[model samples]
Target: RRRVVITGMGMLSPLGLDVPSSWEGILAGRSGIAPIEHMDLSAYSTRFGGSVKGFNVEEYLSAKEARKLDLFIQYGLAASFQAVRDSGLEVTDANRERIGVSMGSGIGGLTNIENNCRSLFEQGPRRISPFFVPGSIINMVSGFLSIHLGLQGPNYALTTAATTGTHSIGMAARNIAYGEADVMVAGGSEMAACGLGLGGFGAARALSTRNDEPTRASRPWDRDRDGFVLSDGSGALVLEELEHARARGARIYAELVGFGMSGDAFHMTAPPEDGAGAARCMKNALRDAGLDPRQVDYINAHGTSTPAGDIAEIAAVKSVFGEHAHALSMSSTKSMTGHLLGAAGAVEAIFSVLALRDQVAPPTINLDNPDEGCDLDLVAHEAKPRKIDVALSNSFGFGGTNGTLVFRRFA
Candidate 1:
């Protein structure tokens, strides 16, 4: 089988606007959760989120070009530019067709949809912009990225709620491994910090309502965690075949050894109490990688800071890793970045790669008190230096869809 490896990564996160800056924040145990300032949240109970601050769209797209795209596309494109440039891959005619794009969004262009609908209702259908359909679609992020980067291979997108990012990367690797493409720009982006987003999630009681303490609101595995805090951002990765990357002297970050996916088939918004589906998902990834659970040194858990989700993922970890669960480190970057929905898996996957590269584990910040079924080291409250050879990332979505990726140190 062709080996797939990650060569470059770019992130536009609440923690920071770029990989280096965001990683610096992670290592220092910083919290990006804050009260929403991008929009008026006066109508909702959940007033805080991990919204990207100080992001200048002009850095990525021209004013004219950016005006036609939604904020979600802008976020994805910015990260893609950074990832492609970081990889140093010259997209000539020879390689352009062999390079593909697989990007996704959990709820694509929600802000645009809301705005256009409001415009249509208040100012009539004629007032709607021409770019509404193309701009607000779930697949437009991938579409815009392909056009911007001139990638002509397997352009695809996923909208599997929170697992969209993991599914994107996993499927992109499959494309490369199967000779469909030599390189893939894969990841996800989300910008749902809007009136409808806040109101909908708040209405569903899916958002944290600790408005007075925004920074401390997202407490994964903590007893006080009300629900996840909505976040906005994008994460991009440059994945290439091992030989293809080495032929060009690209810096290989980590090997994408395993990709596993499953469905809960139990509930739409809640995970099974035993987390059997999640456990099976991880087991499948381990089997795909031909690895035993003990070989994994760390896990970037899908700890969304929600009551049921936080416990269920921990239960899954315990079930899969067994004795090794106590030995390995598990932390939720979502504790700091809140939940970036579709972008969560991609950003967390990058952090998993970094954990193997730097021999350090980012912490599950704001974990002041642990709840039942949550007893992992969690690297709680502070980053810890450790010897890591393999790391796993987990992402579970609203439809009980699950995805797992195993990243090992590139040999």
Candidate 2:
């Protein structure tokens, strides 16, 4: 039987540039949201967000070359570099064909689209840069990374709003398990803090407006919470067939036990009030893994701090786990990193694996008061040492798409 394991993990979150630094800030319950200094927020309702700070694109590409690409790709390349380096999988002519990339971005290159449109309207069509399309498309993150490292295997991008990352990783594992490739770099990235990106979310009334105090903005289960905080980042994982990883003596972080996907089939932007679709997704993953609901020790919730989404997810969990719900821990790293849109699930999956590896659950930084019907061990405000044998991550997006991933401690 074919199996897949996480050989390496990487990320660029609001807290820091790489997986280790981000995980440190996450466990410390650090809030990464800050006032938006780079943009003029004078006209916007929300003035702050969780932004990737102090990034040096030169770390991954030469300045001239980096300038040709969009910021999301830069973030993605940085994450992929870390994942490849961490995996220690040297590419040889004999094995290069066995490696590939599967990366996604929900709103890739919003800034580039805005800029290029301005060029066409104001300065004429010829004024648009030649690199605009190549730099801005969602699949380029996967394409460029593949070219960067001579990976000639399966390469593609999948998008489903915020569920983009989870679907990507799930599909990537399927590729490896089904013998499409021996090694795959899979995940998602995003940079949607531009004018249209920020303004459009504000238009939908989907963003929190806690303007004065940025840190308290993303309170998932709190009674005072208003909406999710829009953020930026990328997350990547190197997945390899178990036997292939074993042949190379790879440092396996966790085993990819199961993946499940579903659709609410009811609303474009909201789940059913009963969370029926979300519950089914979790149950599917359990059935796929052949693991009982009681075996799961922790969950990285798709708790985006939205009023309905938060409570709906809570209801789904209770339906799936019954009394066992209160026994396990769940928290949203979004409480600190804010919502990374397309990248949320990928980073959270990395966090879930890290949670299982360390046997410590990260905290929900700003859960001052749990709303009614939101009673569970939320691991509020501080990390907790727990027996994390199985960790699950949930991702729900607009269009009622849902995905779940189950990771088990490596045997």
Candidate 3:
């Protein structure tokens, strides 16, 4: 199999607007969770989310272009621009056709759909915007990135809720491994910071309701965690074939070695209490890499800061690592950035690569009181320096869907 390496990465997350700023915030153990200021939340019990602040669309796209794109697409394009700029890949006539784009969104264009429907109902059908259909689809992320970057290879997108991010990277690696593309831009983005976006997740009791203190609300693996805090962000990675990146002298981070996917088939909205499926996913990932479980040094957990979900994920981890679990350093940076839905894995993947490159693991904040089932070495409260040879990222989504990706330092 062709080795896949990450040459460049970009992020527009709740922690901050770009990769360097966000990584700085993570290292400082800062929290992006704050009171809902983007929209009014007087009628709702939950008035907090990890909304992206100061994200001016004009910085990435022209005013005319941004006006036609939805919030998610705007974010996707911004992160993609950063990725392209960071990759230093010249998309000239020589390599334009060899590049591909693989991206995903969890909820598509909820804001656009809601506003279009409202306009149609309030001012007759003729008032609906003609671009509503094109703007309200999930795959538009890939489409926008492709057009913006002049990528003419396989343009694809996934919509598997939280796991969508990891799936996008895994599938992109598969494309490169199979000789379908030489380099692929892959990751995930989310825009659930709007009225309908928050209300929908909030109504389902899937959002943190700690109105008194927003930052403390998203306490993953904490005994008091109520639910996830919805956030909007995008993260993208430039995955290039090892030889291609080395030949061009690109800056490499980590090698994509293993990927595993599984389904619980237990519940639509909740994970199986036993965590059998999640354990299977982790074990499969190690096996896929032809690695022993003990070889993993750090795990960017799928700790969504929810009650049952947090416990079940830890249970899965314990089952897979057994006694060696104590040797692993684990953290969920979600406590700081909240949950970015489909973008969670991509953001966490960035954390993993930084962990390997800088030898410092970001913390899982707000762990005032940890839960019993989640007794792993969660690098809590502060960043810790540790050389990580291999790191695994976990992302399990709604409907019991799960995805895991393994990354190894290239030395």
Candidate 4:
């Protein structure tokens, strides 16, 4: 099997436009939540969200060409273009066929869907645009990326809600480890800050209703927690075989180590309250990494600020980390950026890599009051600088899908 390492990463998050700016925002304990400006969301109970700011598609694609693609795919292109440039890998004809791309989104082109649906409703079905179907599908993101990068290898997409990010990375690693590709551009993107995205989740009561206090709304582990704040963003990572990276003098960020997955099977929209399923997935990831529980120093939690979901995740962490639970520095970045949904895992994974690289841990903002039976070092609402060697990123979806990823600094 080939060793996998992250050579480059690109993040287009609500906190900031790029990695450096985004890191500053996260470390400064800034909240990206704001009033709904993407669309006229006056009717939405979840009136505020974390939408990506200053993202211009022309910077990534031709303005004329970008108009035909979906917004989610455009976000993917923006991030992937940045990743390719950051990777410093020359995509010539020789290695073009050996490089691949795997990216995904949970709900693609919601704006397009909503617009077309409204048009169909008011103007009849005949008024629908020819670009409606192509502009609204999920796989078109990968299609746009493939055409732009000219990658001819194993290209695919995953759409498992929040777990899509981890699934994309794991699948890309498997492709390289199985000798199918030498390198892969793997990550996920989501532009779900629009009306339909918020309305659907809000109608389901999955989003926090603290519209009055925006920053304090996303209290992930707090006793007074309400629910998750809606967020939108994209993340991309350059994955290359360890040998291939070294031979080309590429900067190694971290070792893409182990990944684990499981399903609750008990609930369609909720994780098992006992956390039996999530606990098993965490254990499997640790075992796959060949490390003991105590080896992990930090965890980028799936703490979505929901009352039951946060507690269930806490129980799962306790079950796996045991005595090291108290010492572990686990915090949810979602408390600051809200919930990125499908893109959460990838952005959180980027946070994990940055944590290992900079020796500074990001915080879970708005965690003011402590909740009973959910005591853990959530790192509080302040960022702290500490040397980190290993970290894990966790993601759980609405369909009871669970994913855990372990990352280690390259030696």
Candidate 5:
């Protein structure tokens, strides 16, 4: 079987427009959460979001072409351009058929859907535009990426809630390892900070209500934490076979050593209190990578600032890592970026790679008072410089879907 490695990565986060700027924002302990600027939230309890700033679609798409796609697609395409350029891989006729694309969005085109629904109700169905169907579907991101890049192999999409990005990356890696493709562009994007998004999640009581203090809203693993702060962004990574990358002298970032997934089967939007499914998922990833719990030095946790979810994830870590749980450093970048939903996994995965590359762990900001169950070293309040050989990223979504990716320092 072939091994898979990350050659390039692109990010369109609330923290910054690209990877370098975003990583700098994270290391500097900058908070991207702020009062909602793109939409009005007077009617909702949640009044803030981590919205991507200073993005112009014309930089990556033409005016006519951009009009036909939703904001999520535009975000995904922009990140893809960055990844493809950074990887320095040419898409000639010889390699076009061997390349593939896998991208996804959890709740695709929410802004477009909300707008069309209003038009349909106010002005009747005749007012709907011709681009509504094509622009609003979840798989269109993958389709547009394939068309844009001329990739002809294994075109795929995943819409597994918050696990969408991690699942996309994992499945794309499998395609390369099993000889289905030589290279794959895999990641996820989301632009759901619109009226419908905030309204829906607010109605479900899944958002932070600390409107007066937006920057301090997403306090993961803290005793005063309330709920996740809604956010929007996109993340992409270029995965290639080890030999294919070495043959072309590509700069490898990290090796995709293990991928594991599981289902909670307990509730529609809540995980079990015991965290049995999450523990099993981590164990599966470690087993796949042929490594013991003590081998992992850090974990990018799925700490979304929710009271129930945060404690459950902590229990899962202790159950899986045992004695090593206290020794390994784990932090949640969500404390700075807020919860990007479908895009969270891919963005956190990139942060994990950066952690291994730089030998520094990002901080879990706003963690003033860690809860009783949250005893692990969360790298609280500031970045910690240390040697890191292996790292893990965990992502759990609504409907009990869980995914984890194990990354190792490239030797």
Candidate 6:
């Protein structure tokens, strides 16, 4: 029954590289979705996304070290370094073995895999670099972070599509509670704006093709919404045993009270329209936290701005919270951050803690009009100051995997 707490957090979103800048954009209600220019995406129907802004892999990794890895792994390392530094958790020999890492990606290095495959077919097999195999694997994020940080405790990665990060984060806390590690650098990173990512999602009809108005593309709960904007980013957190953090005089951001997970058994690539699976996940989260639904002051919803997803998550909220649904604030930061896929859960969890810290719920920008059944207190169009003592971050992914994290203000 050990208590766990978040000692630090970091993120690389389309808004900016670090949490502060990204958070500013969140509060400012800025949309990070825009046309993808780094790759040849013109042929695809969905050409725009939440591209990483003001990022320099060199900032966190040496040139040679960064050269071989894919952008997804680079982003993951940068976010982990940021989180560890922000926590002031010095990794000395004494603490090295006590620290672990849990990081993952939804689709691994899709961009890299596609590029290498093309090189093999077009140029020949020898054209592929030696780093190709290790670089493109999904578990490398955790492996690289553990190596770079000198963390020796349980090191592993979790991949459950968009829920991967949330599952990673939740599992990290569980590890701390179980005494497997004194601290954990846990989260997810993704760079899905490459040709295969955009084109693949485009083909699946899961991407917003509102090409002309890129900034207005991610309109969660809007009647005209089409699909989510594919985005690139990473988010990580420093989770420590509450007592271990207190012993170090650490700056605790929030308490990790509960982690809930569920499976829809319904469908892949689609959630049930009624959100039954999502509701069960949230309910289990509150139950795990030993809390009542009324205790939740805000929710960082997994509102990917897709036509069906927008309504389904709301339906989940209504079902779980009952009359309290309208009384609590719920905003999809995805409306601005786009869908970070594997990174969504971790980034949204960070935003949940931020909301508790600042007492302001970040805005769900571009909710120009509410679609059918979008009646919850969806903090729309602008940020709002509120009494936020408890917040929840929800992430439901493809294959009906659902993860929910409960965070309580530390004060």
lDDT of 2: 0.94
Output the TM-score of candidate 2.
0.99
Better candidate by lDDT, 3 or 4: 3
Stretches of model 5 off by over 4 angstroms after superposition:
none
Best by lDDT: 2
The TM-score of candidate 5 is 0.99
Q: Candidate 3 residues 285-340, lDDT tens each?
A: 88988899999999999999888888888888888998988899999999899899
Clashes of 2: 0
Each model's Cα RMSD: 0.8, 0.7, 1.1, 1.2, 0.9, 0.9
Score candidate 1 by TM-score against the native. 0.99
Q: State the lDDT of candidate 5 residue by residue for 324-378, as single tens digits.
A: 9999999999999999888898899999999999999999999999998899999
Could you tell me which residue pairs clash in candidate 4?
none
Write the number of the candidate with greater TM-score, choosing between 2 and 6: 2
Comparing 5 and 6 on lDDT, the stronger one: 5
| Best of the two (1, 3) by lDDT | 1
- lDDT of every model, 2 decimals: 0.92, 0.94, 0.88, 0.86, 0.92, 0.91
Higher-TM-score candidate of 1 and 4: 1
Instruction: Pull out the clashing pairs in model 5.
Output: none
lDDT of 3: 0.88
Model 2 Cα shift for residue 138 (angstroms): 0.4
Measure candidate 6: CA RMSD. Answer: 0.9
Candidate 5 has its poorest 10 consecutive residues by lDDT at: 34-43
* Residue-level error in angstroms, candidate 6, position 313: 1.1
Judged by TM-score relative to the true structure, which candidate is superior, 2 or 4?
2
Worst 10 residues of 6 by lDDT: 34-43
